[PDB]
Design a protein around this ligand. Structure first.
Ligand code: AGS
Ligand code: AGS
Ligand code: AGS
Ligand code: ADP
Ligand code: MG
Ligand code: MG
Ligand code: MG
Lengths: 330, 331, 341, 320, 257, 256
DNA sequence: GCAGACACTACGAGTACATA
DNA sequence: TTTATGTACTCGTAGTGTCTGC
């Protein structure tokens, strides 16, 4: 790096350095702290969605076990480096077989993003794990468990990282605002919670971009308007207005309202579709067929949007799908 | 000059990037600071992602350090997991180039370099998985700017690491100032609604509007009469179907008679029109009318959506157009 | 040359009597050749797009565009799967085709264009069959033409530009080439028959030739030459209009489908389709001609025709999304037979 | 840095053939081979965690404890196995002259042999054919279909089945008395249910419960480890109302941090292994689930795709 | 003018230094200060740690007014060091906050000049101050004898065990084709002070090392005629090749029991 | 009709060591005045020529011109039996189906007779146009081979630029850059290592590394190698010999 | 000291597999 | 057999170094 901190993104500037700074996964942190305090650390497997604090947790755990110089005491392998079966046969075998060069403790092997590892490498890793388990522990971080062999899943204790709740995001946001002397309105906080979707990294990126959005970073408070303008997300009022126009008015009014809402602030159609879907899941639909029609048609529309095409045709298709599905109600 | 108006009028600064204000102000404020994050530029084609990143690089470093502190990769060179591993890691794990006294005195050179990965949607997911921890580890010395137009082709972890900046489609209200400025600079005489019609024809694409303006200007000079360009000329250049032919399409469809529709579609397709424009014009005719009830529009919106999604995947325009017109005819 | 279709091909913009507005547009583009952007000519097949491209090159560069030769360039893909491709080069321009392997058309677009982009001041590259690219050569070509533009320019010739991706259509000036009417085809054929020596009684046979070609200069010219050769250079009023052997086989297949709708009929159709695909005939054109031959049968009502065109669209999508061409054609024929019976 | 205690998986690994539980007939056959000593070439197969390699090691130890170091060659996937590094080493070991008791032979244990190269197996064929008088082979693989036909011809096939709840329960109680830890019957049945026949998984979960809470009860067990997602997916696919399946999906998979691709693959596996419903219904469900799988793989991984897949499942189930 | 100017009497010395440990490790930081050029590098398997040190005496003329870290690839440095002769001289030139260093080659002839620049690289490895605690067995033997013993015993097994008991050095390698044992007594030669085996006895040891790491260590045995091996039951082994002004220390981690 | 006898066996093998990788096989054209053999590589980039005079032969007889299309691997396999005292002898007849190689030794009565079949090429595209070169420099063969292989260890291309009294070789790869400068100098003590450069116009040319390796593989032919350069023109790599010279025709890499 | 004579590592070409 | 990347394996060859010998 260069120029120390303050030149880093807030994703990397606020990486936890202690296991007490990892919010959300209270059960996982307490269990691993009990594991390291009692002197029994099994072969861990951290599973969960991105941004939930897996590599941060394992880095803080290794730092707690060893100290500041954990980087030289731990063999960390990731999909960035080559991880063929030659690597498993030489580097992992030598690191597991040999004694510690800097201390008198056990060896820790961190297989970061190990879901991108070949089948034969995992097959060798099974025997490597079983053979040298007396003085070497393996930690496997993965986002998808279907890419791991069943025997590797059997050999490793599974810890699931649940998406970050309300309290954890609020606490981290409060810490960041305290550090940066930044202000933020509570409704903006709820908007950021909604935009998080269990991802702390999205929260940090949006906070950085919104601090850059304000004309003066001091003595101006972040509002929900700033969050929605910087992120480009549709406001709940806009989604409610679009849905009301579609569900209550004729085609001309609905089309005009959707076009006006999209062109007022440059709203994306996929964001509107996601918001409309989230609103419609709370509806008390009378028929079992309205849900089927809505879900299938909107999935087809969002797939076509992902493949790209004409936005006007897709918007009219959204309006028509919603109206036709709700025509089955009565 | 010696270059097309698209390349001639590329935004040299960040002040010249119109429409998109949120991302431009974020980058402008980050210019003074050094908190540039890993960015993910996305949006429709022609919205100005490459121009924005080029300008941001231009006044981050200057004309001198730009070559040394930038690695730009495209689909023009192979980007398998081997190259995306070794070349990207080798560039990132280097130290940043040393600026001169002149560069420090004039430009605010940051202590990091930028690895611009344009057209990142075409990369293999294995290459992106390799890119993940390289992006995370060397953040203090290098920055990554993924430029794509299809977000779903980028895996979830990279979307998590990379700050996302959506580029708005350039509507006729956002991009009217840029085309007005270009017309004033190039001495293009046009009517009141000609620029608005040009922006309406394009679907959030200022580049296509600039090309249409260039073609209209070229025709105007070739005629040599010095007359103002009308909307009909830029409509003929854009390839949109005239309204009388669309009226004939509607009249043929309304009366049924499969054979008549088939023959007229054969003639219309040998006329050489692009089926996507025909479907768009049929949509904007049928949906915006007041002579059709709610059920007809509900069905025709899905019919046009299916036809457009089919036309996007190659296919034969004749068969798709005939099927769409026949399905509309039986509504 | 020996064939009349290549004997009277125009060599200049002023030598074209095919589309007045299109020729005026090309003259406007050639009036200021320095700022000429990347073009993309699209339209129905056989109308004279490449004739327009060569005439525009002659108007921009000069005579010598048609003094062109062929050189072979060696390209190596992954492993040692050696591929031989020959470029039809010339002074003042280059010509390339996706005629290489469809999954290996990216390497030519990468290496050849990076080589010719090394250094009036630019060279023009013509890409025929541009609709046959496989979404990766186009992806490379996006930045290949956006970055290198002051020294290389593109004239991208294609028909039915839907497979062309959105960014390529964004950075290409689209030019539309319509097919002529019956009068223009008849005029060109009359010019041919008066430049050569053909005995003709009533020009209605030329009108019939224009009708048969369906707005196709190449097909009409070859049909005229073939009918003159068969009639010993003396065209008759009731001269039988020729059809390609493929068209006759497709019509026989359509008659078989209409007449008998059993499963032995299906295996006979499979054999016919296997022969047709084995004899260098594209699958999408096969499906289009089969569809429009089925819709020309008068014994079907409107419901069968609508179902036929719907299944034709669905299996055209499938053909565009698949590689085993016989599978989708067999499925389409089975579905049509199930619908009709 | 503090040292770590031995895990319960390896601390309580059986050392004799009587401590291993499960397939009583196979273990009795192994003990009779133990008594006789004329051990034939054997292939041991089954799903992971049911006592495959520990039985081989116990058999070798009891057969020749004094010469385990000398006349046992334990090659495996961690070791480099190829054509030459296998043929040379195994030929040298098989031709090696070592003096055993009259009923004993050298044992070449090819643990994890399903990943071996075919040419290596071809050389192994003649190795076993020539040197069967001195050395004997003992394969152990998860999937026995990878081993070529002639090797399975020149071997004694020993198939291992997943343990019933009774055997895993017996081993769990034995280890509990050995470790002297408090427990509740509900927690033990929860551990057995979570293990699904895998003894190693049961031991790992029991040790995690003991070291994280201290009391093996249902609440602690379900706190540390969740119910398996195949079961929740199976009850999501078999639910009656579409709303029930939608809410099960959302709450128990989406809010639990389960990837959409994992949910789709699990649904495919369950529908393939599902049994109560008719075959054609399963085929239609697999077809539409695979369409959704293609959509997920192309990049469109959202909640809406899973909801649409469930809606299509219900539109198929209610018979239009 | 340039900040760092480290001249070499002969260009062959630094090539020999690099080739001694160019294969075991490929990332290295050269810590240039007034005292000398020192470098610590850790193997990719985190088994073999190399602690290079070149004093100010080994340089013809040396000046480093400010400390600077030099992140280098040993593969690239080795392949760029081949561009020289034995008579040629070397001068490591660096500026402040450098992008690269200039491998400026010279000669007796002023016509022969060759300039090479290899870009520096960013390494965040925190640098460990080794205490070098008391070793149970401290022994010195000629490098040729140690290299021969290691090469002969590497063909037998993958692990070489070194037992130092009752003032007797013993190397054993139990393998598949057979087992071998080389026993050398600590004799002293008054005839030659370089072939004498020296051994200091405090406590007996029993340490097993890998064969490939021992081969990598003995590949750097051309730098000194004698290698001083110090062993300990709780510390990594030390293989010090003393240079004219500094030393080349190899720290090897023994296998677990 | 051809009776060629070398003074010593270790001459023609030493010549063809350079020929090994520059071109797979050549079409010999043996005349009474001398022996020549020219061929073109696969990519038509590097061309090589050979010229051996009669003075290098103890007894050279050539009644009629003889065309020999022969490979090099089998020929070198034959020549591997060349003792330090054994003498080469090339024997051919009318319409040679196979060249006759015979060996004679003085200290021993043993005789070695070998024959090699003659292949076909059917491509004798020959043309010589350029004779005048703007720049001309002479370097030792060992020094030139060392410098070019050292630069090839750093980059896949080598840049050779000439200025007044500064023979400069520039190499720039991906790991870094390398600049080498050697100046002309004449010394009486060691004329073999003397370096001279006479120049008319500056020359800037970039060449490929593999072709330079092919050129330098014949480093044992001459103690000093005279490479002369031309601006915006292909350069010639000439190797001296007692009774002739060998030259390498290499085109530039699109100089501009 | 120099030329082989050797065994060694490294590079290149080719084949085969890819869900249980 | 086609299939289009990436991995792993196997083999063969070319350099690359070191040990014997005169
Ligand atoms: N529980 C948490 N408490 C505090 N910060 C968190 C937490 N989880 C994530 N973060 C933040 O998220 C940033 C990046 O997440 P990481 O934990 O480093 O990566 P990850 O969570 O393992 O996601 P993947 O699977 O690697 S893409 C960290 O630098 C933290 O700032
Ligand atoms: N926001 C903008 N302001 C001004 N000109 C713009 C803007 N966006 C696009 N342009 C024009 O569009 C051309 C450059 O387009 P690009 O910046 O390459 O678009 P893009 O983001 O690269 O879209 P792609 O690369 O095809 S996905 C120039 O003619 C610019 O003048
Ligand atoms: N039948 C059994 N009786 C007792 N312990 C068992 C039994 N099966 C498995 N275990 C325990 O499971 C752990 C390891 O079992 P292994 O036999 O090594 O698994 P495995 O049968 O080899 O399956 P794979 O395919 O190798 S992963 C040890 O702690 C054993 O004690
Ligand atoms: N103005 C014209 N006069 C005479 N013939 C023409 C004219 N325009 C086109 N043609 C005919 O068209 C043929 C070429 O068409 P072609 O380039 O194959 O069309 P496409 O490129 O659309 O397939 C030529 O043989 C030529 O005879
Ligand atoms: Mg992580
Ligand atoms: Mg771009
Ligand atoms: Mg096992």
């Amino acid at each position: 790096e260069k120029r120390s901190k303050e030149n880093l993104p807030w994703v990397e500037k606020y990486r936890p350095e202690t296991l007490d700074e990892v919010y959300g996964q209270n059960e996982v942190i307490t269990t691993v702290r009990k594991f390291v305090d009692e002197g029994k650390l099994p072969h861990l497997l951290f599973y969960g969605p991105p941004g939930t604090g897996k590599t941060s947790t394992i880095v803080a755990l290794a730092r707690e076990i060893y100290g500041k110089n954990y980087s030289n005491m731990v063999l960390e392998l990731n999909a960035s480096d080559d991880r063929g079966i030659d690597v498993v046969r030489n580097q992992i075998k030598d690191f597991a077989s040999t004694r510690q060069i800097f201390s008198k403790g056990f060896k820790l092997i961190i297989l970061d993003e190990a879901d991108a590892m070949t089948n034969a490498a995992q097959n060798a890793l099974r025997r490597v794990i079983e053979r040298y388990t007396k003085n070497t522990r393996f930690c496997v971080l993965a986002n998808y468990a279907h890419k791991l062999t069943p025997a590797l899943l059997s050999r490793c204790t599974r810890f699931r990282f649940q998406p970050l709740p309300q309290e954890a995001i609020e606490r981290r946001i409060a810490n960041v605002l305290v550090h940066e002397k930044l202000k933020l309105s509570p409704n903006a906080e709820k908007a950021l919670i909604e935009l998080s979707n269990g991802d702390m990294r999205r929260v940090l990126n949006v906070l950085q971009s919104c601090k850059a959005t304000l004309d003066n970073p001091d003595e101006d408070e972040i509002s929900d308007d700033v969050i929605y303008e910087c992120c480009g997300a549709p406001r709940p009022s806009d989604l409610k207005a679009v849905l009301k126009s579609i569900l209550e008015d004729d085609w001309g009014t609905a089309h005009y309202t959707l076009n006006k809402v999209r062109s007022a602030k440059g709203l994306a159609l996929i964001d509107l579709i996601e918001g409309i879907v989230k609103i419609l899941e709370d509806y008390e639909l009378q028929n079992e067929e309205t849900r089927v029609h809505l879900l299938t048609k909107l999935a087809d529309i969002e797939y076509s949007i992902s493949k790209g095409g004409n936005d006007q045709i897709q918007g009219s298709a959204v309006i028509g799908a919603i109206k036709a599905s709700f025509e089955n109600e009565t | 000059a010696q270059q097309p108006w698209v390349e001639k009028y590329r935004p040299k600064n960040l002040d010249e990037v119109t429409a998109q204000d949120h991302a431009v102000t974020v980058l402008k404020k980050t210019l003074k600071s050094a908190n540039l994050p890993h960015m993910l530029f996305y949006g429709p084609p022609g919205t100005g992602k490459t121009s924005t990143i080029l300008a941001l690089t231009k006044e981050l470093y200057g004309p001198d350090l730009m070559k040394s502190r930038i690695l730009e990769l495209n689909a023009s060179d192979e980007r398998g997991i081997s190259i995306v591993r070794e070349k990207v890691k080798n560039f990132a794990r280097l130290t940043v180039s040393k600026p001169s006294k002149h560069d420090l005195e004039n430009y605010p050179c940051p202590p990091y370099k930028i690895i611009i990965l344009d057209e990142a949607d075409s990369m293999t997911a294995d290459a992106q998985s390799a890119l993940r921890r390289t992006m995370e580890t060397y953040s203090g010395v290098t920055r990554f700017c993924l430029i794509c137009n299809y977000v779903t082709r980028i895996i979830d972890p990279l979307a998590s690491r990379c700050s996302k900046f959506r580029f708005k489609a350039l509507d006729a209200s956002n991009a009217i100032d840029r085309l007005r400025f270009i017309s004033e600079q190039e001495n293009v005489k046009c009517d009141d609604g000609v620029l608005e019609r040009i922006l309406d024809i394009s679907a959030g694409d200022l580049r296509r509007g600039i090309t249409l303006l260039q073609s209209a200007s070229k025709g105007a000079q070739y005629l040599g009469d010095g007359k103002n360009i009308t909307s009909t000329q830029v409509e003929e250049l854009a390839g949109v179907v005239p309204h009388d032919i669309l009226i004939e399409i509607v009249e043929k469809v309304k009366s049924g008679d499969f054979d008549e529709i088939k023959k007229y579609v054969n003639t219309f397709m040998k006329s050489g029109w692009s089926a996507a424009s025909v479907v768009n014009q049929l949509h904007e005719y049928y949906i915006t009318n007041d002579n059709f009830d709610t059920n007809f529009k509900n069905q025709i919106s899905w019919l046009l959506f299916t036809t457009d999604s089919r036309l996007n995947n190659g296919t034969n325009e004749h068969i798709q157009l005939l099927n769409l017109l026949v399905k509309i005819s039986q509504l | 040359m020996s064939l009349w279709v290549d004997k009277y091909r125009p060599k200049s913009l002023n030598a074209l009597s095919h589309n007045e507005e299109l020729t005026n547009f090309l003259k406007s583009l050639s009036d200021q050749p320095r700022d000429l952007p990347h073009l993309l000519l699209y339209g129905p097949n056989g109308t004279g797009k490449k004739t327009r491209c060569m005439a525009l090159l002659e108007s921009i560069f000069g005579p010598g565009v048609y003094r062109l030769k062929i050189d072979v360039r060696q390209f190596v893909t992954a492993s040692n799967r050696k591929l031989e491709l020959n470029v039809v080069s010339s002074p003042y321009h280059l010509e390339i085709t996706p005629s290489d392997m469809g999954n290996n058309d990216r390497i030519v677009i990468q290496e050849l264009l990076k080589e010719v982009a090394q250094m009036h001041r630019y060279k023009c590259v013509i890409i025929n069959e541009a609709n046959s690219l496989t979404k990766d050569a186009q992806a490379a070509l996006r930045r290949t033409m956006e970055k290198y533009s002051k020294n290389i320019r593109l004239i991208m010739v294609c028909d039915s530009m839907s497979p062309i991706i959105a960014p390529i259509k964004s950075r290409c000036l689209l030019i539309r080439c319509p097919a002529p009417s019956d009068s223009e085809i008849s005029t060109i054929l009359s010019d041919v028959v008066t430049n050569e020596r053909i005995q003709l009684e009533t020009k209605d046979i030329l009108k019939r030739i224009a009708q048969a070609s369906n707005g196709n200069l190449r097909v009409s010219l070859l049909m005229l030459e073939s009918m003159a050769l068969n009639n010993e250079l003396a065209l008759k009023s009731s001269s039988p209009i020729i059809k390609p052997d493929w068209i006759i086989v497709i019509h026989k297949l359509t008659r078989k489908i209409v007449k008998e709708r059993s499963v032995n009929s299906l295996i006979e159709c499979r054999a016919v389709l296997y022969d047709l695909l084995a004899h260098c005939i594209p699958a999408n054109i096969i499906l289009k001609e089969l569809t429009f031959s089925l819709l020309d049968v008068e014994t079907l009502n409107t419901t069968n025709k609508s179902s036929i065109i719907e299944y034709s669209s669905v299996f055209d999508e499938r053909l565009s999304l698949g590689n085993k061409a016989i599978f989708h054609l067999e499925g389409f024929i089975a579905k049509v037979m199930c619908c009709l019976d | 840095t503090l040292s770590l205690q031995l895990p319960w998986v390896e601390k309580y690994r059986p050392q004799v053939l009587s401590d291993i539980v499960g397939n009583k007939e196979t273990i009795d056959r192994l003990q009779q081979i133990a008594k006789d000593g004329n051990m034939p070439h054997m292939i041991i197969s089954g799903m992971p965690g049911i006592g495959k390699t520990t039985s081989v090691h116990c058999l070798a130890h009891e057969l020749l404890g004094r010469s385990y170091a000398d006349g046992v060659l334990e090659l495996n996937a961690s070791d480099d196995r190829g054509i030459d590094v296998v043929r040379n080493q195994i030929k040298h070991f098989a031709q090696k002259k070592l003096h055993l008791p009259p009923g004993k032979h050298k044992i070449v244990i090819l643990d994890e042999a399903d990943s071996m190269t075919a040419g290596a197996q071809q050389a192994l064929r003649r190795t076993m054919e020539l040197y069967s008088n001195s050395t004997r082979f003992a394969f152990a693989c998860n999937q026995s279909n990878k081993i070529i036909e002639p090797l399975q011809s020149r071997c004694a096939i020993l198939r291992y089945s997943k343990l019933s709840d009774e055997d895993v329960l017996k081993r769990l109680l034995q280890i509990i008395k050995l470790e002297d830890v408090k427990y509740t019957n509900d927690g033990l049945e929860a551990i057995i249910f979570t293990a699904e026949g895998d003894m190693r998984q049961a031991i790992n979960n029991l040790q995690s419960t003991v070291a994280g809470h201290g009391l093996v009860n249902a609440d602690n067990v379900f706190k540390i480890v969740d119910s398996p997602h195949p079961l929740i997916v199976k009850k999501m696919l078999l639910a009656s109302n579409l709303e029930d399946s939608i809410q099960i999906l959302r709450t128990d998979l989406w809010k639990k941090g389960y990837s959409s691709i994992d949910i789709v693959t699990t649904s495919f596996r369950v529908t393939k292994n599902l049994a109560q419903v008719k075959e054609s219904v399963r085929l239609e469900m697999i077809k539409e689930i695979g369409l959704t799988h293609m959509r997920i793989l192309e990049g469109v991984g959202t909640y809406l795709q899973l909801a649409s897949m469930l809606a299509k499942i219900h539109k198929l189930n209610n018979k239009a | 003018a340039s900040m760092l100017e480290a001249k070499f009497e002969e260009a062959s010395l630094f090539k020999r230094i690099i080739d001694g440990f160019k294969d075991c490790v490929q990332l290295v930081n050269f810590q240039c200060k007034e005292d000398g050029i020192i470098a610590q590098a850790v193997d990719d398997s985190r088994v073999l740690l190399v602690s290079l040190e070149i004093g100010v005496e080994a340089f013809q003329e040396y000046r480093c007014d400010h400390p600077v870290t030099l992140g280098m690839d040993l593969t690239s440095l080795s392949k760029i060091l081949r561009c020289g002769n034995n008579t040629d001289t070397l001068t490591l030139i660096a500026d402040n906050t450098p992008d690269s260093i200039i491998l400026l080659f010279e000669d007796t002839k002023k016509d022969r000049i060759a300039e090479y620049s290899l870009k520096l690289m960013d390494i965040d490895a925190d640098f460990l101050k080794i205490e070098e605690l008391q070793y149970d067995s401290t022994l010195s033997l000629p490098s040729s004898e140690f290299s021969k013993i290691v090469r002969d015993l590497s063909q037998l097994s993958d692990s070489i065990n070194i037992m130092i008991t009752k003032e007797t050095i013993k190397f054993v390698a139990d393998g598949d084709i057979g087992s071998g044992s080389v026993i050398i007594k600590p004799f002293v030669d008054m005839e030659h002070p370089e072939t004498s085996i020296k051994l200091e006895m405090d406590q007996p040891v029993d340490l097993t090392f890998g064969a490939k790491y021992l081969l990598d260590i003995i590949k750097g045995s051309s730098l000194s005629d004698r290698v001083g091996i110090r062993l300990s039951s709780e510390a990594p082994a030390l293989f010090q090749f003393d240079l004219k002004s500094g030393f080349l220390q190899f720290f090897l981690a023994p296998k677990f029991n």
